[PDB]
Amino acid sequence: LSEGVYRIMQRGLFGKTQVGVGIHMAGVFHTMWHVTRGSVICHETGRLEPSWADVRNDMISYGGGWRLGDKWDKEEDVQVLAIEPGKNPKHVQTKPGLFKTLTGEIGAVTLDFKPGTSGSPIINKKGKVIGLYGNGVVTKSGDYVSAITQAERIGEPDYEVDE
Amino acid sequence: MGSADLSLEKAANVQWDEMADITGSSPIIEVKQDEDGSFSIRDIEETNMIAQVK
Asked: How far is B4 from chain A, CA to nearest CA, in Å?
């Protein structure tokens, strides 16, 4: 109900385990698709129902559309508010790379946090979320890289005069 | 009704920590492509190199 970063826990035989991370901002809970896979999330106040998802980009919103509009500007340092399971929140800053793919260029974060951090917010200097950590790629026994997962501007040139 | 899947636990708020470490800040360029149902992803790092003799 309150704006902030939330751990997404799943009750099991041995209690609740953090399967991912989500951000509630402007009244909508934003997280990754592969984390919750559409399952409703309940809290003291009540149960959250999904509203929008993008399985190709691994994103899902609860209680409304994607309100995180701030995207990453190229050649700007970002911070990942990694919520590792059990451990306290940890802030790490990095200079993102690029994901050269058809349909656009996505920021490439080289930080390799522990599993379960999928959905950790990626924050710009202005203190606003510009992406989500979790969906990325691993090398042959090498350093995991996560894409700055953001909803809008997934295929736009980001240099035109129209909007 | 009756169901139960996943709960929430707040951990932090969106704030920029200026004292965060900047280690591991590789601006790698990753070319992802697919040809025949598989996906081929190469990562090109561009590390800086100063000349040195032996």
From this structure: 8
